């Protein structure tokens, strides 16, 4: 046999293509939205002190 | 030339990018056939055997 | 007058016996994408014998081998299309099932009408005066007698009559003298049995009607035509010119009229002997194919289906006692310009019928509907910016005539 | 909502669209491709012929 042993997190065969998924791909949008919200709050707050 | 995909369904495929595969199929049928059986009747170690 | 029920009222419909009785087996799935738009079948062979008293005759005047053909083709499309402003159309008729009922019926009725027209245009044999209706038992038994006299065996012979005539025959049957079952059945349901006089009698209300076409004068053939088997071995049609007609009339001879040659008789195809109808010989007749007009001098060139083969170099193919030549006297059946609905009689192997399956139109929603052995393709689309949806129904027929000498028209004989 | 497919040839992908005109009852297909060209630096190529 071929001595290569593959390991997958989650694997499916949808349309002639092997599609894999781990544990981070589902939560990138909320995280990169949270970062933007935090930055855009921080600079606005620092703009006007008193 | 083997490029004769079987009724490439083209059933509302929505996707970006593509594969170059050729589709072929298997066909299973059931038929009623007349076959003649031989009944061996050797007395040794049991007699009736169809 | 505002509240409307959801149940449609019953409507009218015709009857269908012609498609069921005609042969749909030999030409079935034969016109494919590889064969073309036309396909042909072979013809049987006939031989002639020599009569000599000697035996060391290894070299003599032998027969010949000639092969015939019978070609069948396709017809025009059968289409019904409906368009609607889908707002108003879907206000009060949802999902469009009620339109499905009267489209398939229309398509099939048109197919049957076209088949009847084709049969009565291509048939050769004729019987009785078109004026007299069918009244008695002999008027139905005559077709079977003639068909058996010619010599046709392979198949089943059928005769189709209008509803009113069948009623007359049932009334005649009610007058029988000893058959209690027949008398009771005729008295109760006015239903004649299956085999009537040796041929299968059939009742049909939807039957094509035709007009004779005005003609007048002493018609006679002007030029001797060519009716050799070499000429007529592929189509069984021949063109002849007639003189002595009226000066100038349009539509002198319509499609379907029977022209009768007085002095040329039918022959029993195998024994090659003339036919005797009890007291008089049976004359040859042919059917006009297309409309024929008359020019100045009354010279009418007409193409007829059914040919009087009298080949002199191949005697084995003869079908008429004598050769038609110039100066012979002819006639046309019926009156001047009356219109009538003829009654049909035919062998099974007279005409064929087939359908061409239609591929799905690309990127257009479609479906297939089955109805009395016919497949109709249904397409839906939304062409146009008038908020109008469009639908169409499609079916494609194919026709063939095998031998013109095994069918035709028949009326009553007074 | 037009039936389509993708074909490959020498590592190039070509999109084929199949559609039909209904009233005219005609079926037509089209194969499409879109190229793009760039010239990074003119001083790294040219034409060469045999010198006398």
């Amino acid at each position: 046999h071929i001595p290569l042993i593959p390991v997958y997190g989650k694997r499916w065969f949808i349309d002639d293509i092997e599609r894999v998924e781990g544990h981070i791909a589902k939560a990138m949008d909320p995280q990169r939205l949270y970062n933007l919200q935090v930055s855009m709050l921080a600079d606005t707050a620092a703009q006007d002190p008193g | 030339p083997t490029s004769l995909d079987v009724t490439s369904m083209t059933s509302w495929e929505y996707n970006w990018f593509g594969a170059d595969v050729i589709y072929i199929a298997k066909y299973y049928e059931v038929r009623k056939e007349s076959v003649d059986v031989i009944s061996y009747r050797h007395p040794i170690t049991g007699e009736i055997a169809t | 007058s505002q509240i409307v029920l959801k149940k449609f009222l019953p409507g009218f419909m015709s009857d269908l016996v012609l498609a069921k009785t005609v042969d749909r087996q030999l030409l079935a799935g034969e016109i494919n994408s590889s064969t073309g738009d036309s396909v042909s079948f072979k013809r049987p062979h006939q031989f002639s014998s020599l009569r000599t008293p000697t035996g060391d005759i290894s070299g003599q005047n032998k027969n010949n081998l000639i092969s015939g053909k019978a070609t069948g083709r396709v017809g025009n499309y059968i289409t019904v299309a409906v368009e609607y402003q889908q707002l108003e159309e879907a206000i009060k008729l949802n999902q469009l099932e009620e339109i499905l009922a009267p489209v398939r019926q229309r398509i099939v009725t048109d197919l049957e009408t076209e088949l009847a027209h084709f049969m009565m245009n291509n048939g050769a044999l004729s019987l009785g005066s078109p004026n007299t209706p069918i009244t008695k038992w002999s008027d139905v038994a005559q077709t079977a007698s003639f068909l058996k006299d010619l010599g046709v065996n392979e198949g089943e012979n059928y005769a189709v009559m209008d509803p009113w005539s069948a009623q007359r025959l049932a009334d005649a049957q009610t007058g029988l003298h000893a058959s209690d079952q027949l008398v009771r059945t005729a008295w109760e349901n006015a239903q004649i049995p299956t085999n009537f006089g040796g041929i299968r009698a059939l009742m049909s209300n939807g039957l094509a009607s035709r007009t004779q076409g005005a003609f007048g004068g002493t018609l006679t053939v002007k030029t001797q035509p060519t009716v050799t088997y070499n000429a007529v071995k592929d189509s069984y049609q021949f063109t002849v010119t007639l003189t002595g007609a009226t000066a100038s009339v349009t539509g002198f001879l319509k499609a379907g009229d029977q022209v009768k040659f007085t002095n040329t008789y039918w022959l029993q195809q195998q024994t090659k002997q003339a036919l005797y109808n009890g007291a008089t010989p049976i004359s040859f007749t042919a059917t006009v194919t297309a409309d024929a007009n008359s020019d100045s001098g009354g010279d009418v060139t007409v193409t007829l289906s059914g040919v009087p083969i009298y080949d002199t170099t191949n005697p084995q193919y003869n079908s008429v006692s004598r050769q038609v030549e110039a100066g012979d006297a002819v006639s046309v059946v019926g009156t001047a310009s009356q219109t009538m609905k003829p009654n049909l009689f035919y062998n099974k192997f007279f005409c064929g019928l087939g359908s061409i399956p239609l591929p799905k139109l690309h990127s257009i929603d479609s479906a297939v509907a089955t109805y009395e052995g016919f497949s109709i393709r249904v397409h839906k689309y939304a062409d146009g910016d008038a908020n109008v949806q469009k639908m169409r129904f499609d079916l494609l027929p194919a026709y063939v005539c095998f031998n013109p000498h095994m069918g035709g028209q028949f009326f009553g004989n007074p």
Side-chain angles (χ1 to χ4, degrees), chain A, chain B, chain C:
Chain A
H1 313 299
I2 307 286
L4 298 186
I5 317 294
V7 188
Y8 305 97
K10 286 169 288 189
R11 174 205 175 260
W12 310 285
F13 198 93
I14 304 293
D15 270 345
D16 287 291
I17 301 299
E18 181 166 0
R19 311 179 187 271
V20 302
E21 188 175 318
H23 206 78
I24 305 286
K26 280 208 289 188
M28 298 183 283
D29 307 77
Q31 169 80 82
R32 74 166 78 244
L33 216 51
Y34 185 88
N35 284 338
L36 171 69
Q37 293 305 343
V38 166
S39 302
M40 182 179 72
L41 174 63
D43 74 308
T44 294
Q47 182 143 310
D48 295 332
Chain B
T2 43
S3 180
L4 247 305
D5 303 354
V6 208
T7 320
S8 43
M9 300 131 306
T10 72
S11 182
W12 245 291
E13 225 279 86
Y14 278 135
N15 199 243
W16 239 116
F17 235 105
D20 65 337
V21 293
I22 296 288
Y23 294 87
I24 44 172
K26 237 147 14 243
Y27 179 58
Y28 289 90
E29 278 214 358
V30 294
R31 305 195 276 219
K32 272 162 141 302
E33 289 181 352
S34 64
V35 64
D36 193 359
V37 300
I38 303 102
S39 169
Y40 286 72
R41 221 205 66 80
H42 69 297
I44 294 92
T45 63
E47 64 183 1
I48 305 303
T50 312
Chain C
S1 73
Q2 313 213 10
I3 307 304
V4 177
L5 270 294
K6 67 172 311 163
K7 294 180 181 180
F8 274 65
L9 297 195
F12 301 92
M13 65 179 288
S14 71
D15 206 330
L16 294 155
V17 288
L18 278 298
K20 293 159 199 32
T21 45
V22 65
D23 189 358
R24 291 138 56 68
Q25 283 290 6
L26 186 40
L27 202 173
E30 294 294 328
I31 276 169
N32 49 57
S33 46
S34 44
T35 299
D37 51 354
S38 66
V39 65
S40 53
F41 310 86
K42 276 172 188 177
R43 267 202 166 98
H45 277 104
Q46 285 158 98
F47 296 85
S48 85
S49 65
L50 281 80
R51 204 61 65 65
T52 51
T54 74
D56 262 352
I57 46 176
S58 300
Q60 277 181 344
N61 292 318
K62 333 180 181 154
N63 290 319
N64 275 339
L65 270 71
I66 297 94
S67 298
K69 288 164 35 62
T71 300
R73 274 151 271 211
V74 295
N76 309 318
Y77 269 84
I78 307 294
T79 53
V80 291
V82 295
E83 72 186 340
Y84 51 78
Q85 296 270 330
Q86 82 176 347
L87 277 73
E88 268 85 358
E89 199 263 336
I91 292 171
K92 276 158 180 89
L93 174 142
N94 285 74
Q95 293 179 356
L96 283 74
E97 181 265 301
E98 300 79 2
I99 58 154
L100 192 53
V103 286
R104 59 183 64 188
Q105 279 207 102
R106 183 85 255 167
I107 285 173
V108 170
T109 302
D110 278 359
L111 188 153
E112 192 205 29
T113 299
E114 201 76 10
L115 165 68
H117 261 289
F118 168 85
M119 272 199 321
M120 91 185 168
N121 284 357
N122 286 259
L125 314 181
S126 178
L127 277 186
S129 49
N131 291 318
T132 306
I134 285 181
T135 309
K136 45 177 77 169
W137 180 86
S138 62
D139 287 339
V140 189
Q142 52 175 10
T143 60
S145 69
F146 195 17
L147 275 190
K148 179 60 185 291
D149 206 345
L150 279 180
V152 301
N153 54 1
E154 174 47 79
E156 281 66 20
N157 326 281
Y158 294 92
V160 194
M161 29 200 67
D162 56 293
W164 286 100
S165 286
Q167 183 214 290
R168 271 194 286 278
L169 269 298
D171 197 358
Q173 176 169 303
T174 62
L176 280 194
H177 283 292
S179 191
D180 45 7
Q181 177 172 89
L182 304 182
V183 166
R184 166 175 263 271
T185 295
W187 193 257
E188 301 276 80
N189 308 79
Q191 206 68 69
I192 52 173
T194 302
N195 285 251
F196 201 85
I199 189 160
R200 294 175 83 83
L202 293 180
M203 185 180 288
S204 171
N205 44 30
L207 215 63
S209 83
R210 83 164 148 96
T211 310
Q212 270 290 86
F215 48 78
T218 48
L219 283 83
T220 183
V221 295
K222 156 172 174 182
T223 304
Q224 181 175 135
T226 302
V227 289
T228 57
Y229 198 70
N230 299 113
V232 302
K233 77 178 166 63
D234 279 316
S235 46
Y236 263 52
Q237 276 172 340
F238 78 114
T239 308
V240 66
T241 187
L242 278 298
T243 185
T246 301
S248 180
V249 190
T250 296
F252 185 84
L253 277 165
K254 294 292 184 68
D257 298 68
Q258 323 273 340
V259 186
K260 153 179 297 299
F261 300 83
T262 300
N263 301 323
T264 62
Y265 315 119
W266 283 109
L267 294 174
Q268 207 280 332
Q269 314 288 338
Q270 188 86 332
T271 61
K272 303 291 198 255
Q273 310 266 314
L275 271 43
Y276 196 44
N277 173 16
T280 185
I282 299 170
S283 307
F284 183 89
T285 183
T287 298
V288 183
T289 288
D291 287 358
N293 297 294
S294 296
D295 73 326
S296 57
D299 310 278
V300 188
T301 61
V302 64
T303 293
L304 306 174
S305 159
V307 309
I309 295 168
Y310 197 63
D311 190 357
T312 187
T313 187
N314 310 319
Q316 63 252 15
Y317 290 110
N318 293 317
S319 84
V320 171
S321 75
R322 54 179 304 279
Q323 172 165 3
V324 179
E325 71 206 330
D328 271 23
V330 299
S331 71
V332 185
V333 303
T335 74
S337 313
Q338 77 192 340
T339 175
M340 75 284 276
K341 217 177 291 202
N343 312 310
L344 300 157
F345 80 102
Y346 57 92
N347 196 246
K348 202 214 181 72
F349 290 101
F350 170 42
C351 55
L353 190 47
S355 299
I356 321 295
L358 296 175
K360 176 182 94 54
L361 213 58
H362 285 169
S363 68
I364 306 284
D365 293 78
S366 65
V368 175
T370 305
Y371 177 91
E372 277 75 1
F374 295 110
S375 316
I376 295 98
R377 203 87 193 198
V378 169
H379 288 95
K380 305 142 201 153
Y381 47 101
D383 191 39
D385 204 359
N387 284 351
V388 58
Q389 184 178 2
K390 307 182 147 268
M391 211 184 317
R392 71 182 298 164
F393 296 72
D394 269 305
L395 169 64
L396 183 63
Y399 299 104
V400 57
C401 190
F402 295 124
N403 201 309
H405 303 147
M406 308 197 257
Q409 300 167 354
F410 85 101
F411 302 90
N413 193 359

